[PDB]
Design a protein around this ligand. Sequence first.
Ligand SMILES: *[C@@H]1O[C@H](CO)[C@@H](O)[C@H](O)[C@H]1NC(C)=O
Ligand SMILES: *[C@@H]1O[C@H](CO)[C@@H](O)[C@H](O)[C@H]1NC(C)=O
Ligand SMILES: *[C@@H]1O[C@H](CO)[C@@H](O)[C@H](O)[C@H]1NC(C)=O
Ligand SMILES: *[C@@H]1O[C@H](CO)[C@@H](O)[C@H](O)[C@H]1NC(C)=O
Lengths: 421, 421, 421, 421
Amino acid sequence: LRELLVYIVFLVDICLLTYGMTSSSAYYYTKVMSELFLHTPSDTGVSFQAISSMADFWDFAQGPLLDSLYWTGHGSHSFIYYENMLLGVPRLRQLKVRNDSCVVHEDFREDILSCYDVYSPDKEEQLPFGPFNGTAWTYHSQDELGGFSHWGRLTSYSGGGYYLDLPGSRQGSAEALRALQEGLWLDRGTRVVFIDFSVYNANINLFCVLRLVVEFPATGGAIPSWQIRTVKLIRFIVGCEVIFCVFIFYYVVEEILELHIHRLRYSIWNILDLVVILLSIVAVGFHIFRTLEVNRLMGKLLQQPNTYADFEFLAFWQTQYNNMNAVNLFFAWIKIFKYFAVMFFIVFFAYAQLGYLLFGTQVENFSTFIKCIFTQFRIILGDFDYNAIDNANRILGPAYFVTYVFFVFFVLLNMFLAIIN
Amino acid sequence: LRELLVYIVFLVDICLLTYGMTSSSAYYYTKVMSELFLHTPSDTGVSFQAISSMADFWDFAQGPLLDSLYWTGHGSHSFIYYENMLLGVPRLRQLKVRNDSCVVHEDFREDILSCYDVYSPDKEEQLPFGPFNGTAWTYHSQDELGGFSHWGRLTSYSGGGYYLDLPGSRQGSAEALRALQEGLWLDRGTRVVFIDFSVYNANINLFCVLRLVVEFPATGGAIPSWQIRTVKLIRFIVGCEVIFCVFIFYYVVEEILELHIHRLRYSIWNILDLVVILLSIVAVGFHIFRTLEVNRLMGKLLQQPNTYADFEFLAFWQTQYNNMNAVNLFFAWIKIFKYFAVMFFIVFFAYAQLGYLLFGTQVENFSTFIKCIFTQFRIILGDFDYNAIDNANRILGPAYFVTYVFFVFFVLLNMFLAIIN
Amino acid sequence: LRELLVYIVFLVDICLLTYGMTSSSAYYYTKVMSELFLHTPSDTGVSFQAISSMADFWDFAQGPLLDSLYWTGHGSHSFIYYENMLLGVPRLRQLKVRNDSCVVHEDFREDILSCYDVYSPDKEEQLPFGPFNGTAWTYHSQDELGGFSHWGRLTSYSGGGYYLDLPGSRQGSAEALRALQEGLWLDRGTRVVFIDFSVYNANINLFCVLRLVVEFPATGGAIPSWQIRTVKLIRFIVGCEVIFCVFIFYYVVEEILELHIHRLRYSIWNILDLVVILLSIVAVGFHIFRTLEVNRLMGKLLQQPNTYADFEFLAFWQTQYNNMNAVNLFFAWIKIFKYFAVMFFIVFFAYAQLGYLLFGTQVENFSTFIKCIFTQFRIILGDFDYNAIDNANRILGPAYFVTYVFFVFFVLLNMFLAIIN
Amino acid sequence: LRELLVYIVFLVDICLLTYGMTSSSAYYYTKVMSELFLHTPSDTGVSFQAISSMADFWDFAQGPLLDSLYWTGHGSHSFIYYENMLLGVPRLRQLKVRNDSCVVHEDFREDILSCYDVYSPDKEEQLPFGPFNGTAWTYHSQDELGGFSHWGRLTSYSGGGYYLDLPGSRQGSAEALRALQEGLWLDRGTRVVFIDFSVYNANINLFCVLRLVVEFPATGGAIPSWQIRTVKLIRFIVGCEVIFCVFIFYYVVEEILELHIHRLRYSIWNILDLVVILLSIVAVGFHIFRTLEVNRLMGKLLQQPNTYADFEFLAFWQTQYNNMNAVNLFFAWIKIFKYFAVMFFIVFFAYAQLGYLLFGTQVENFSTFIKCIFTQFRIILGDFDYNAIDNANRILGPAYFVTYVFFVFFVLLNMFLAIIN
Ligand SMILES: *[C@@H]1O[C@H](CO)[C@@H](O)[C@H](O)[C@H]1NC(C)=O
Ligand SMILES: *[C@@H]1O[C@H](CO)[C@@H](O)[C@H](O)[C@H]1NC(C)=O
Ligand SMILES: *[C@@H]1O[C@H](CO)[C@@H](O)[C@H](O)[C@H]1NC(C)=O
Ligand SMILES: *[C@@H]1O[C@H](CO)[C@@H](O)[C@H](O)[C@H]1NC(C)=O
């Protein structure tokens, strides 16, 4: 039709555009790259998904990441598999928090005088502490480095300081970090230690970026997380987009001509048009930023080759970019169709609240309030761990469980008997 | 309204009161604290969740709890992570049972003369047995120590004797326990060995208590259990409670004025009022007991610092306290609404009884009668282990299973056909 | 009533009789006893649930069963935990099969001349093969030993020969089995090697028996199985039974007086009476056999203490005895109520047959025809392993799976629409 | 009947024919054979299901496959268990791809000059590269070897070159492969390395074949797969088939006599006849090919015993043969009965597409488009891994999950309310 088949042409263009850079050879690259640094055992046998102390972080960052980064085809650019190059050098930016962040209660004094705190956008340390200026002991601002607010497991973070751009040799990084041990760069009151680098292979034209987080909470310990993102970086790779750039102006006019002479009563198909139109401009804006930044970053590197080229910013934005391409593509696929629970939610969150207060600690599920909707929703499906509800209190755990399951069955049965006719 | 909005004000006060001490930074403290002592391997590789013998308990209590408690910021109060202090010293109270507890049957004599027994509140040993008075070999009563009845995995316990308050140094505790080996303090007929201590950090104001149970049943072996509880201990932290203290007297009067001139016919909303009123007085009584006992326990410790300050009593009562706050909070959330199976249960417990007698041993599920309701109820949901029903007898296991599942489907189908109209 | 309340008295007597010997302290004894021999690692690290070769069976039977049986309270009767005695000595009976059991096909000769076979009640070796008479190299009949037909994993067995009653000392059993290695007692064509012994504790009066099977199939390898059974052995322990003996004669008369003057038309409540009556005589017959055999077996042992007292026979019959007590108890509990699929089964077994022929090997589920009803029934519930259906052929696996699940949903939906009214 | 009972006779003949060679002793042979080479640890502890690097492939192929193939009843034909012979010798055929396969983009030059590629039927290396002619360094065509197109995990393959027929001794294969290391036969740009051999036992007359794939993708790493197939090879074993050969001509005539004088309107029972008739000729053709090829392969081996007898071709065709026997047997069992979703699929594949683009990498499920129908169909059943949807992005993962599950429940509920009457 003159109005429907145009949208199919718009579909197949926006389909072929999203799949334009959809390497079908990416998730095995994520396998090799994830399970080369994460799951590798050390000499004493510590891996990144199973780090919890602090003295073994300095075994992880000297055995399975220093003896797992520097190979010597092979030249001097440190191909990590022999099939993908290390571009730039990693860096280790550390947040800290300060001693008088909050005050201890007066029952405990005289021994417990220094009182660190949970991380907030306030309460950091904008102060140097080490022996002499070496960049790794001096704070640097949020806009001297430009790194966006990382989102870890507990709370968000910022563009913190104390970073150390690594050298590019096996003996060099060991003589850096071993001399960094006795300085105690990881002192008592750290909140996150990052380590960031990235690698690129020729064979399928994919940049993969690797962010490795070792966060030391206020309670103690270490609860690690990783973030491996693998996308195209680059892109006849460009001519399919100039027909896609037409459709934004093609559809905003057909929207506003209905909106210009609109009546005083405007359905959800209008916002269905709007949510897929507004994401398109955000998508097409990112290409210019990529073509500036990727070129700037390799221009920064072919002279002065020992420097951290920051790929994490446009890596995160490229990842949210093709996430947004997936989401507006899905909205386009749903747009092809253009041809009581009040007594349930307030008790649903009540059982969630009961599960959060009973099962506070002792379970790493049920542990914030949101996760007490996701767990308590998975229980409606059938994924549950009763051997850690019954291993928590032994009296109210099963008492919660049996009557919650009977409540779910009662409320799923009650609605249908009067709605069947 | 004048009767409904007051209850919302009562809700938001009782909500903010329960969340007054709801550290959102507690379950990672339970992670670090649990997985620092439980899951730590020894030199020969024994962990607390995987202890079963008796000669390896004395490797667990000399490698991963003696080389995992005494670190040397750092002073002399034994910060276990470098971020949480060891307050007091642990202790090791041991129950025992006596030789003539029950008599062997007459077919077996002449070799099997000593006959220990399952644990009961009777049948203990109120007798010293070691070389000389050192507190670890002499019984102490239930009210010389004051410890409540612990509830282990098999049956309850009492405030038993034989305890050993540990010293506060690395060489000292090793010279204690190594000299305690050749005395054979853990002899043949023990029923529980406890070890209790607790740690507190400044950074978020939480007391976590740790009770570690190694119980040696009448059959032999060891089947360990732990109990880690982590709560506030302390608490402008107090002024939100004086408005909450008003509402008890506010609502008991409005209950009894209906009850004073009551008719001769009193619904379940009355006991709905009663169950949330009666828990409130029990809740507000605990604060005075905390403010006495926490102060007494740190008064006991700043002079004579080498002593066990008993936190387990008010720790258990604080834990049942905020459990009760969760339960009456849930009853308040359910109280916002104030604006045939006879041929199924007797066969349900019959299949439970059949499963208990067929699957007696060989499965650590199905193993008491209650657990044959919880397992045989989980089978209605979908969590089951058919590779240990079929690995038990191979003939009646599947015969039980298939016809029980067909019975559940038949009785879940039969009720709906006549109730649909 | 005069007919109903008598049955309740019969219930409570038959309930208290079955629970007369229902040690509530048995499944932890099965835990300690199972996980003391099964899951124990060797020096080179082989456990009984993970044995598959033949040269490591002789590490399992020299490290974690010879250094895990002989401890030196402690006398000379080999308490294995220090809390349960080793009564008698173990023995190792071996079946074999003969060289000309079946003939190879004529394409393969000249190299493959000896042709052993799958086990049958025929085709054994009633022949000695070792150097000299020592009982371990000479066949013994099915009625020289009296052992019942064991049922292993593949097929049944018989009372085979070649057994070796072990000595009762640490050096003695090692000098037995090490001298038994170079004789090659486990030669190429074995089908089962057993090892049987049993242990008894005073503390709760339970005999546990342990049968450990290492079967070498015709294909090769070893696919082990165990059989641990733990029951009373013994039994004021006897006077509750003389009232139970009354009810057999009480109810057979009331059955036959209805059957003597019966009409020419006899419902399933009659066979409901019969199945619970006929099991009662079988139950009460076993007590006399226990009181003879248990007494005979300890009479065999207090003189000549170095001999295998065969507990496995009445152990198996005691286990099927209290299984039958569970089953007729369940029938009594179901008897308190005395106050199209033709187009589904033939395709059900057809999909079972398709799954057996597609998924023949490569999966240890789906592997006989029966197990292709149990697996293909578990798929209706939700326990399935799609990562070994898709890891078998990759083309017909999912093709079987998706349309079988759609068939199950179609046939579970089709029956209800016409049966709702 | 004269038309129905003939088909039952045809059933029981075609049943007994398919089960004619249905070794009930095959899946334990697959257990021993799979878990003898796959799951065996090396000296440094690498197994075949857990190989990912390249320098540890040369530990897998020198410890747990060179010290796990050559045993020294025992003669000189290398019985691998002592109960199944090694017939022939293994071989190691390697595919490669060439340097100028695709060109790098112009932003990256001067360092990244060699650019290998994903595997295709084009782009190989038909060129020798090693020092001198030894067969292992020279390409051989697809029809010099005759090996069919293997189907690995990523994409299909072909009959590639570079193979090395192994010798038949322990010292010989080690002196082959250790001298093959310094030549670097596994160089940077390999795509698959195969290793193929097969073993046969006398005891139940089964040939099992073993294909072991170590594929090095374009990204790097190694993602291994295996293929173990175990069938009869041979077959009074032949006389049951001459009655089965009658039924093809018996039923094609009864089909075409209906088809010769057929009306101008031909139901799906006709193609139901056709799909079970046409597979029968394909089945009966394979027997002649087996009787030629099995005889040729053992004729190739009794003289010149050090050669690879290719069993993989007729092994794959025998496996698809008894797969086809299972499928037409199932169609025969279904043939005994001869006596809106348009708004669901386009959003079903839309959610699949959203899951493929969100969950591209980071999950080895959800990873191609097809697997986003199999996973997103398993979610309707209940097998899902929410701890890798929530561990992927943390924002859209649960947002996808909750509304997809609510969509599935809404569309499964909506169809029944109007179809109930
Ligand atoms: C941090 O603590 C140290 C003592 O350990 C103290 O000297 C210093 O002044 C404190 N600095 C801040 C910013 O709290
Ligand atoms: C306990 O047993 C010992 C022998 O081991 C005996 O000497 C002692 O009297 C017994 N004591 C009790 C209280 O049973
Ligand atoms: C078994 O095989 C051996 C050769 O290994 C042969 O000497 C002996 O006669 C055979 N015995 C039987 C009973 O098959
Ligand atoms: C492969 O690369 C090498 C350099 O490593 C080069 O000398 C050779 O000519 C290339 N051959 C092909 C076929 O690309």
